[PDB]
Every structure is written in C-alpha cells, then in structure tokens.
C-alpha cells in the first residue's frame, strides 16, 4: 500500500488545499517517496495559481522531478518567456531525456498542451510508462475527438488497476464523451468520488455536465449553485451556468451577467476568446451579405 | 436457401490525426438554422436563413446568434492544470452515437408564446416602441425553433403572423402620431391612416382602442356615415360599459345626420393589405410584393428592399419556406 | 399611461348667412400693406403704411393702390346668364385651406431692381425730371413687396437708399439750374450746390458727370484749391480718355496757382447730409429730422412736414419700420 | 336616353349658337320635350343678349315654362321695369306657384340673383327638385362663401347622377373654391368638356382660372389669348388678362388698356363699378388723413 494515496487522490479530484495539508503531514519513509510527495505539493500550489511558492522554493540543487515542476511553473507565470521555454523544451527532447522520469514527461506534455501542441505532448507521453501518463493521453485523445484511441488507452488503465483514482476519472471522461447510457455511469463515478472525499468544484461540474448531457437541467441547477457558492471565479461553473440559464428560460440579462463575470474569472478558460472570435466572424459575414 | 453468413479481411511513433468535431457532426445531420448556430457554423446558418426565409441583412440578428452560440456546449475539467474539456449535449442523446447527434433544444415554441403576453400588455398600456421591439424579437426567434409535429409548425406560422399584424399596425399608428394636423388635407390623411389601422387583425381588447381612435377622428372630420360603422363594430366587440355608453351616444348622433363630408381613400367594403412602407392600401387584386418570412405586404416599388417589419429580409424574394422541424425533410 | 382617446357630443326654411369673404381672410392673416390692398381693404392698408413707414399724404399712392387692387381676384362664369364668380388666388395655395390663405405675390423685388436700369439710363442722358419720377415710383413701390428672407429685406432697404440718393441729388441739380448767375454772391451759391451734389452716393458713371460739373464751376470761380481735389477724385474714378485728358489739363493749371479765391460754405473734410428741402449741409453731429421710409435728412425746421423725396411721408415721425416679409412677425 | 342631351349640354357650357342650331334640328317626339326644347332655345337667345327674339316670339298663349323665360327676358331688356317686375314676382311667390314647374323657379331665382337677393332666390330654388336647381344652389352657396353648404348640395348631385354635365360643372366650381390639390381636378373637368365639345369662352376662362390659382401665369396666357381672339368683348377674359398682365411684369399701360376696354364690354360685369367704388373710397380716405 502507497503512503501517498490520500495526497495524490486529493490532487487529482481538484481538492488542492487538502492535498497540500496532507502532504505536509506525512512521514519520510524513503527519499524516493520524499521527492514524490514534494512533486505533488508543488503541483498543488501550481493548481492554486500560487506560482511564487513553486518558483522561489525549488532551487537549482532540487531534484530533477522538481526541476520539471518548476519548469512548468516558470511557463505558467511568465507569458513573455513562454515561447523561449517551449523552444528550449524542443531542444531537450531532441537531445536526450530520462524516460523513467515520468514527472518530467508530464510537465513537458502539460507545457505542450498549453502551447497548443498536442502532437508534441503525445510524443512525449508515449515515452513514459505510468498511470498518469496514460490518463493524460486519454484526455488528449478525447480532445482530438478520437474516442476510439481513447478507448484503447483506457482499456490499458482498466487492465492494470481498475480501482485507481486516475482509472475511474478516465472512465468518466470516456463515458461523458460516449454519451447514451454511459452518461449515467460517469455521474456515479463523479458522485462516488465526491461522497468518499469532498465535493470539489471539479467534481461538482463533472456531475453537472452529466446531468446537462441527459437534458436534466433542473437536476444540474443545484450542483452549479453549490459550485458558485464555493468559488465565484471558477470558469467552468460560469460557462455551465450560461448553458443552464438558457435551457431554463431565463432572460438574456442573466446570460449577459455570466458573460461579464467570466471576463474576471482570472483563470484562463478559452471560452471568452472563442466568443469574441465568433463576434468578429459574425460582423465579417454581415458585411459579406451586404457590403456597406 | 440458407442462413445469415452465405466481406473482405484486410491485406517509429506517429501522432494521431483529429477526428470530426461534434459540432461538424451537428452541421452534417441538420438543416435547421438554430442547430448550425449552436455548432458555431455561422456562415452555413446564414446560408440556411437566406435560402429558406430570405434573410439578407443579418445585423439585427447579432444578439440572437451570439447568445445561441453560447448555450451550445458545456465544459468540465479533466486533469488538474490542463485545458478543460467540452461537452456537446444532444437532443437525441439516448441514441446519438458518434455520428448521428443533433443538438439540444434551447428555445421552445411555448417560451415564445409566453413572451407574446408581455407584448400584449405593453401594447395595452400604450408603449408602442417597446412592444414592436419585443414583437420583432419573437418574429426573428421563430426560425430558431426546433419543433416536433405539423401542428406546431402551424402554430409557429400563426405566431409570425401575429407579430407581423402588430408590427405593421403599431407602425401605422406611430407614423400617424408624427404627422401634422394643420391643413384639412393633412387631417384627411390622418383619418385615412386610423381607418387602415382598423383593418389590422389584433386582439379584441386592442381592436377596441383602434376603433375608439378612428371613431373620434372620423367624427371630428364630420364623416358620420363611416364613423357610424366604426361605432357599430366597436359596440359589437363588447367594450367596457363606460365606452359602450359614450359610443352609443356618438352613434345616435351620427345617425341623426348620416352623411360623409369628404371622400377619403378608404374602401369599407373592399379587402386590402397595408403597404408596410408607404402606409397606403393595396386592394385585393392589385400587384403586391411580400416579405418571404412574415407576410408583410408592400407596393411593388419596394421589391428587393429591406422589409420594415422583420428588418432583415428581402421583399419579394422567392424562398424555400420556413424550416424548423425534422418533418420537413422526408 | 394609455392611448390617444382617454370631447363633448352636442345636445320652415331659413336662408343661410354669408361666410367670411376670402379677402377678409387675407386681412386676418397678413400685416403687409400689399396684401390688404389686394384684398380691397384700403383703410387697413393705409393704417399699416402710416404706422410702419410714416405715410400721411396718400394722394400720390392712388395709381399704385388701384392697380394693385385690380390684380387681386380672377373671375369665371358658372351657369349661363348668372353673375360671374370670383377666384382669390393664394400664394400659399398648396396648403391655404379655408382659413390660412394669403394672396399671390404680384410685385417681386427683382422687377423693381430691373426698373432701376431705366432710371439710370434716364439719368445718364440727362432727363432728370423723368428719372426722378421713375425713382420715386420704385421708392413708393418697395413697401408693397412680399419678400422671403433677411437678405432680400436688406436689398429692398438698399434699393430705397439708392432711390433717395438719386432723388435728392437730381433735386439739388434741378434747383441749381433754376438759380440766377448774375451776382458774384449768386455764383458762390451755385458752386456750393454743385459741391454738395458731389457728396451724393451715385454710380461711378454719374459721379463723374457731377464732378465734371463741379470742376468747371469751381474753376470759373477761381477756387483752384477745392477745384483741384474735385479733379483728383474725378481722375480716380477712371473717366473716358477725352475727359481724363481735359481733367489733367485743368488739374495742372490748378496746381500752378493752388489758391481758393472765396470762402464758400462747403467743408471738404467733414461729413454732412444734404437738407432735402433747403439744400444746405447738415454737419454730422448737428440736429436733423429724417424721413422714416427713405432716410432723407432735413434741417429740424421741417419736422412734421411732407418729405420732398417720397412726397407722402411725415418728416421725423417715429415708426415701426418697413414691413415686407412674414419674417418680421415672429 | 334623353333626346335633348346635346342641346342642354351646349347651353350649359356656354356654346349658345351650337345649342340654338341643334335645337332647331331635333324631331318632336313628344309635347313635353317640345316645350323643353323651346325653353332652352330661348334661354340660348337670352345668353346671346338677343332679348328681342324671346320677347317677340313668346306670346301670352305660350306654355307656362316659356312665360317664365319671357319674364326673365323682360327683366334683362328693360332696366326701367326691373323694380316693378321684381315686385310682381314677390307677390306671385307669396300667392301660389307650381312647384313642379322648375323652369319657372329657375327663372325667378335668376331674376332674384340679378336683383341682388340671394335669399329670395334660394328660397325659390328650395321648392324645386331638379338637377339645374341644385346646380344653381351650389353656385349661389359658393357666392355666399359657404363652401360647406355647397359641398352638401354637390354631394346630392353626385349621388343622383355622377356623369351629368351639371354635376361635372358644379364639381369644378366647388373645386375652384376649395383650392389646393382640387384645383388640378377642376382644370381637367373643364378640359375634358372642351375636348368633347368645343372650347368656349366659358371653358377657356374656367381653365384659365385654374392655372392662375396655381400660380401658373404663363400657362394661362395661351388660354386667355384664344378667348380674346374669339370675342373681344367677353368681360371675364378682360379681367383675367389684367390679373395675368400684372403677374407677368408688363407695364401699367397694359392694365390701363384692358380697363378702358372693359368699359365697352357691353356685358354687365360688376368689376368696373367695384373699381370706381374703390376709386371713391380711396379719394375719401385721402381726405381723412389730410383734411384739405
């Protein structure tokens, strides 16, 4: 049994502060486990957008896995530096990488996904053998609308460890993309993790998306209101509330309030940029049917 | 014969290539404009609106398009610190599969029929500009419906007709109120417009107010023969008691001198349509160009122009017809 | 709020009684004298002329009044053998109605400006009596204008000024020609008058002839210092070559002896106005009574008398001012 | 259809000689129509100021309708007799009149109008029922500046016979008094009667007055010159030419020629008397502002 079970569990379901709290309490029964714990601790500070902690505390003498976390933190914190970091990453990968260092591969692939380079991220993940590497592949494959490939990678996680948190979570993502009967499946996975641990923003919206996919808008309203009460700035709640509002017949002034609230979500969800893009697409197509 | 067996079995690291997005699947499976707007395919949606219902000026659609776009997909986080996922909720979700999905229905016909009531109240209290705005929103919203059976397609068409009747009527009245009342000839024109407004098909409570207005104006003109018939029609709708009494009084005063003082351009026994742009009557046989969506009638000078009612269509364009149901694609 | 409805319905053979005549409608709607003369209301027209522009002696207006009266109404037969009908043509005929009409414009400002040219020619050929008659007709005609904008009111006032300048100038010259030239003192008076005529504001072609006359007279008097300045001003207007040469000759003869022989009553460097009745100068600060219509200046002995220029006004009467446009009744 | 259509038509538009010519040609298809024809024949001789024909040929044995025409002729021909004729007319009316004899009522009302008694004339016309009676009422009402009452009487003629010559003519007179858009209407009525029949002095000046009312003086000049060429003595042409001259900027010598020509118009148009009256009014008001 894994001494870091609760720590990784808290991190993957989005319960970052519980992860940080539980990492600072566990006893150093190795130096392998010691570094693994510190990796999740700083990844949790990353998830809270507290990049300063990561950047200040991981020094050039710190372990290679921590250097990978700090690489990612440097990227997230410094927009001006992103293109150069990506460039250096490209060279590292072309040169030689410790393939057993899955923490490094996951950080590299994270950076690539944010730099909108799923090919590079998948190429990096392919080199690793770990459960989170497969899970991140499942996710990226789903984003590429390759439900078939995602199903194969998920089957790998299912054969290796059926009861693992990452395996349940990947099962839910695959189910949410499959639709049909499988949607109810996803819901209970999300529910079962909420009622073992704690209902996080991530799990609240997972459950919400399952309900909304079945057309059960009133059932989703409670979940979204609870998520809105926990954190007024989590964007996925705001987007889902727009969808839900319109399916409950509420006035356009509500959709407008959520759209204005989303410009201050201070978390980088693409929805507003896509929205403004479709605003520009529309203006241009107006001038195509009537060249004023 | 035989059974169920008596095909062809076929013959580095490469990043996979994308599959079709669920919004593209939407566009493939649907010919209804709202589904394309939910998909984010604004251009194919505009093509559908132009070919089916005659939209050419899409400016006044911006709100409807963007807001519809915003309800199309849900979003949820997968792994921490990575870009979130999108969900694409289908209306046929029980059996959509990978290839057959078509998006959830976000605007139902009865939401619109309910907005009708706020339009009616606005009209009754006399806020004509705001009632016209609300009416036009219902009108432009109707082509974004998704609708099951033939009776709902009928109701939607009746709804469009209602919004049109009120828009052209209130437009007539708003223009009559902007006109001068100095000349006798100017007053004759005002009465003409009030009499045209009488031939709009509104709800009895509103037709009572338009007949009250017309009765007053034709009485001041001393056109007591036509004024008398306005009074008789108002009395037949069954107004509230105080108005019925004032009306019976004006009626017996009209009949104690049943002569029209001036020939106006208003035929009592002759059906016409109101030119929605010049506010003159187009009598039932004569040439007319129409709005392909609302049914607004226009005198032929205006073919090819932007309909004053809908504000987005081409007068007289030939079109497929409104499409708001899977039924219409056998 | 509400609508546009939320009045009072009322309670042998007799010959009907007359309605208001269209000429009375004219008088009601207009404060311009010509409209009242067209209406046949001579007394209210005279009141308007007296209060606005100071007419008290209306005799010299008889022609203008009667002829104006004659253009006011048209006539056409209705039934055979019955008295003919009258028509009352309105200038606002498009929208006059029963109550608002106001008569057609029969004398336009440019008709008068055109008559100016025949006045000018008459002056040039030297027919002073007939030029004064034509000038006075233009002057008295100006208050019968109907005029649209402020610039035309300006032009009409300038026209009155032109007719005045020419009338008083030619009056001065006509009186100088009637005076004896025997005494030295009589000749001094003649020169004085020629020098005053120099200060009339005429057209350059005419100011050249008055300077030629003055130059000759002041040269015979041996007032070579003032004669020299008349010569320099005549040369500066640019006369025809033969006159320029004769003038340059007289000028160098004046400068080869630049002395005035007699003190005359004529101040070269001092602005004055010519008393239109006694033909003496009234220097710019001193007391003067004026014609309320033309601007003729008179020495104060003459206040209350009949202006020699217009022949119909009261010198020095206070008046509203010329009215010849609807503009002036805001 | 009326056998006397052309005869009455010619008379009412002022084409008197054509009326006389066509009356002497029609065939005696009644004794009712016979007397009606003779009435218009002698009314046409009246219109030509040939009173001698009327006075000599209508004898005391002639029909009552002709006696009414001859009454009118006696009045027009004999100034010294007018006041006595009017007196006798007053008594006849007070005693008993055949109200079906519209010819008598029209002759009585004619006499009253000339004796400047519109009340008596309207009182007589009120008793009759015929189209010319209404038309003459329309005319008298217009002279009384009661356009409202004239409109009602005109509406009566319009309901009874829209296409009748008297109804068109009354429509034109009402239009000419209404002004505005209706002026163009009057013109075409007059024009349409001229181009069906013949352009008479009456129709030429009707059209002229329509043009002059719209301010279209140059358009009126042609009509008036044509009327002047047909008859140098018709007064309405002379008056209209005075108005037109002044609106075309012509010299006062022209207005004076027309005024002198009007003293020999040998038709009794009131304009000269009103003019001389305004001459006297002016002389008197001159002496009011300066009592010499």
From Swiss-Prot, chains A, D:
Domain of life: Eukaryota
Keywords: Cytoplasm, Cytoplasmic vesicle, ER-Golgi transport, Golgi apparatus, Membrane, Phosphoprotein, Protein transport, Transport, Ubl conjugation
Modified residues (Phosphoserine): 30, 84
One Pfam family it belongs to: Coatomer_E
InterPro entries reported in the protein's UniProt record: Coatomer_esu, TPR-like_helical_dom_sf
Gene3D superfamilies: Tetratricopeptide repeat domain
UniProt PTM comment: Phosphorylated by PKA.
GO cellular component: COPI vesicle coat; cytosol; endoplasmic reticulum membrane; Golgi apparatus; Golgi membrane; nucleoplasm; transport vesicle
SUPFAM superfamilies documented for this protein: TPR-like (SSF48452)
Membrane topology summary: Peripheral membrane protein
GO annotation, biological process: endoplasmic reticulum to Golgi vesicle-mediated transport; intra-Golgi vesicle-mediated transport; protein localization to axon; protein transport; retrograde vesicle-mediated transport, Golgi to endoplasmic reticulum
Compartment(s) where it occurs, according to its Swiss-Prot or TrEMBL record: Cytoplasm; Golgi apparatus membrane; Cytoplasmic vesicle, COPI-coated vesicle membrane
GO molecular function list: structural molecule activity
Residues spanning the membrane: none
Main location class: cytoplasm
Entries under PANTHER family matching the protein: COATOMER SUBUNIT EPSILON
Protein family (similarity comment): Belongs to the COPE family.
Protein function: The coatomer is a cytosolic protein complex that binds to dilysine motifs and reversibly associates with Golgi non-clathrin-coated vesicles, which further mediate biosynthetic protein transport from the ER, via the Golgi up to the trans Golgi network. The coatomer complex is required for budding from Golgi membranes, and is essential for the retrograde Golgi-to-ER transport of dilysine-tagged proteins.
Subunit structure: Oligomeric complex that consists of at least the alpha, beta, beta', gamma, delta, epsilon and zeta subunits.
Identification of the protein by name: Coatomer subunit epsilon
Lineage: Eukaryota, Metazoa, Chordata, Craniata, Vertebrata
Swiss-Prot record, chains B, C:
Disease connection: Autoinflammation and autoimmunity, systemic, with immune dysregulation: An autoinflammatory disorder with systemic manifestations. Clinical features include inflammatory arthritis, interstitial lung disease, alveolar hemorrhage, neuromyelitis optica, and immune complex-mediated renal disease. AIAISD inheritance is autosomal dominant with incomplete penetrance.
Record protein name field: Coatomer subunit alpha
PTM-bearing positions, type Phosphoserine: 299
Residues with PTM Omega-N-methylarginine: 71
Subcellular location(s) of the protein: Cytoplasm; Golgi apparatus membrane; Cytoplasmic vesicle, COPI-coated vesicle membrane
Region forming the signal peptide: none
Tissues in which the protein is found: Uniformly expressed in a wide range of adult and fetal tissues. Xenin is found in gastric, duodenal and jejunal mucosa. Circulates in the blood. Seems to be confined to specific endocrine cells.
Disulfide links within the chain: none
Source organism of the structure: Homo sapiens (Human)
Highest taxon above the source species: Eukaryota
Gene that produces this protein: COPA
Complex formation: Oligomeric complex that consists of at least the alpha, beta, beta', gamma, delta, epsilon and zeta subunits. Interacts with SCYL1. Interacts with JAGN1. Interacts with TMEM41B. Interacts with SVEP1. Probably interacts with PEX11A.
Function: The coatomer is a cytosolic protein complex that binds to dilysine motifs and reversibly associates with Golgi non-clathrin-coated vesicles, which further mediate biosynthetic protein transport from the ER, via the Golgi up to the trans Golgi network. Coatomer complex is required for budding from Golgi membranes, and is essential for the retrograde Golgi-to-ER transport of dilysine-tagged proteins. Xenin stimulates exocrine pancreatic secretion. It inhibits pentagastrin-stimulated secretion of acid, to induce exocrine pancreatic secretion and to affect small and large intestinal motility. In the gut, xenin interacts with the neurotensin receptor.
């Amino acid at each position: 049994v894994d001494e870091l079970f609760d720590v990784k569990n808290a991190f993957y379901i989005g319960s970052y502060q519980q992860c940080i709290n539980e990492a600072q309490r566990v006893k150093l029964s190795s130096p392998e486990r010691d570094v693994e714990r510190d990796v999740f601790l700083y990844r949790a500070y990353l998830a809270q957008r507290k990049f300063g902690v990561v950047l200040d505390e991981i020094k050039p003498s710190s372990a290679p896995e921590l250097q990978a976390v700090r690489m990612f933190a440097d990227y997230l914190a410094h927009e001006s530096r992103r293109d150069s970091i990506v460039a250096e990453l490209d060279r590292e990968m072309s040169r030689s990488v410790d393939v057993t260092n899955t923490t490094f591969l996951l950080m590299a692939a994270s950076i690539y996904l944010h730099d909108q380079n799923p090919d590079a991220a998948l190429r990096a993940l392919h080199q690793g053998d770990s459960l989170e590497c497969t899970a991140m592949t499942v996710q990226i494959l789903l984003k590429l609308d390759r439900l078939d490939l995602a199903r194969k990678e998920l089957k790998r996680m299912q054969d290796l460890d059926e009861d693992a948190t990452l395996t349940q979570l990947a099962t839910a993502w695959v189910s949410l993309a499959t639709g049909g009967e499988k949607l109810q499946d996803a819901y209970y996975i999300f529910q079962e993790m909420a009622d073992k641990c704690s209902p996080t923003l991530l799990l609240l919206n997972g459950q919400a998306a399952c309900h909304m996919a079945q057309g059960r808008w009133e059932a989703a309203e409670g979940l979204l209101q609870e998520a809105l009460d926990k954190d007024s700035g989590y964007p996925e709640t705001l987007v889902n509330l727009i969808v839900l509002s319109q399916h409950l017949g509420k006035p356009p002034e509500v959709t407008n309030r959520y759209l204005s609230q989303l410009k201050d979500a201070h978390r980088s969800h693409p929805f507003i940029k896509e929205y403004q893009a479709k605003e520009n697409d529309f203006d241009r197509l107006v001038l195509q049917y009537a060249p004023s | 014969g035989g059974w169920d067996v008596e095909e062809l079995p076929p013959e580095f690291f490469v990043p996979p290539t994308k599959g079709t997005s669920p919004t593209q699947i939407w566009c493939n499976n649907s010919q209804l404009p709202v589904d394309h707007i939910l998909a984010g395919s604004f251009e194919t949606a505009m093509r559908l609106l132009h070919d089916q219902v005659g939209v050419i000026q899409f400016g006044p659609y911006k709100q409807l398009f963007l807001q519809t776009y915003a309800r199309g997909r849900t979003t949820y986080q997968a792994l921490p610190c990575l870009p979130s996922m999108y969900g694409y909720p289908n209306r046929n979700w029980k059996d959509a599969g990978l290839k057959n999905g078509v998006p959830a229905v976000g605007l139902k016909l009865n939401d619109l029929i309910q907005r009708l009531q706020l339009c009616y109240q606005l009209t009754t209290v006399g806020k004509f500009e705001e009632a016209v705005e609300k009416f036009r929103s219902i009108l432009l919203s109707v082509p974004l419906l998704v609708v099951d059976n033939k009776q709902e397609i009928a109701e939607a068409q009746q709804l469009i007709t209602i919004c049109r009747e009120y828009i052209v009527g209130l437009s007539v009245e708003t223009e009559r109120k902007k006109l001068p009342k100095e000349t006798l000839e100017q007053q004759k024109r005002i009465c003409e417009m009030a009499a045209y407004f009488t031939h709009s098909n509104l709800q009895p409570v509103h037709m009572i107010l338009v007949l009250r207005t017309a009765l007053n104006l034709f009485f001041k003109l001393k056109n007591f023969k036509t004024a008398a018939t306005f009074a008789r029609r108002l009395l037949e709708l069954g107004p509230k008691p105080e108005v019925a009494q004032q009306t019976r009084k004006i009626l017996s005063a009209c009949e104690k001198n049943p002569t029209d003082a001036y020939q106006l351009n208003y035929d009592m026994h002759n059906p016409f349509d109101i030119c929605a742009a010049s506010y003159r009557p187009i009598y039932r046989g004569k040439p007319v160009e129409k709005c392909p969506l609302s049914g607004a009638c226009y005198s032929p000078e205006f073919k090819g122009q932007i309909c004053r009612v809908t504000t987005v269509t081409e007068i007289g364009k030939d079109v497929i017809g409104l499409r708001i149901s899977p039924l219409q694609f056998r």
